[PDB]
Design a protein around this nucleic acid. Structure first.
Length: 52
DNA sequence: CATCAGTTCGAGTCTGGTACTGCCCAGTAGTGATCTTATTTCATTATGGTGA
C-alpha cells in the first residue's frame, strides 16, 4: 500500500501479473431501489404531524 | 446499428458527533454480644543455717 500511495514509484512499473489473476466474477447486488414518492410520504408525515 | 464504456440520479447502509431515561445496590461507620488470647496475680512448695 505504501508504494502504491506514492505516485512517483507507480510511474516506473511494468505490472504483468495483474492480467493473470482474477477471482471476482459473481457478486450479489443490492436488494432493490424501492420506490419513494415525495408527495405521498410528505402527506403521511403531515397527517402524523397532525396526528396527536 | 446495437454493444460496450464513460456519466448521473437517487436510494441503501454505517457511523460518528451529540444528548438523555428508568431504575436499588454497595460500602462504611455506630452499637451490643460473645468469645479469645499475650500477658499479670494468688496461693502452695522447696531450700537455706543456727540459737535454745
Amino acid at each position: 500500500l505504501v508504494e502504491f500511495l506514492t505516485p512517483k514509484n507507480l510511474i516506473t512499473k511494468s505490472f504483468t501479473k495483474i492480467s493473470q489473476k482474477h477471482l471476482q466474477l459473481s457478486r450479489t447486488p443490492r436488494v432493490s431501489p424501492k420506490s419513494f414518492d415525495q408527495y405521498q410520504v410528505k402527506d403521511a408525515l403531515l397527517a402524523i404531524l397532525a396526528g396527536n
